[PDB]
């Protein structure tokens, strides 16, 4: 999970263009929390809402579905 968090976020900031947005934020764990986990999970969790739904809703469901299995493991 650490290697794929690091791979995914360095490549998201590469594909968007702003590698400085990674280089300034990956030095501290709050930058990992809010510039990668909080920031890039906007269109994920907005897969369905009371306004409607789109093609990411099957990933909005599974993201909760994976949150449900995980806790059931506990």
């Amino acid at each position: 999970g650490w290697v794929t968090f690091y791979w995914h976020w360095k490549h998201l900031t590469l594909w968007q263009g702003n590698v400085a947005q990674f280089d300034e934020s990956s030095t501290y764990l709050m930058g990992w929390l809010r510039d990668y986990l909080w920031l890039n999970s906007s269109q994920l969790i907005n897969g369905y809402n009371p306004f409607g739904m789109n093609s990411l809703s099957v990933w909005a469901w599974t993201f909760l579905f994976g949150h449900l299995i995980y806790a059931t493991g506990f």
């Binding site: 709050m30 909080w38 999970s41 969790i45 809402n49 909760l64």
Partner: peptide, 25 residues
């Protein structure tokens, strides 16, 4: 209007209202 769903508690409560503890630096 939005607490019908677990995704509503995720989006509009945890994600939306954590937007002041995460940028409090």
């Amino acid at each position: 209007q939005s607490a019908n769903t677990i995704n509503g508690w995720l989006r509009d409560f945890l994600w939306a209202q954590s937007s002041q503890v995460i940028q409090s630096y």
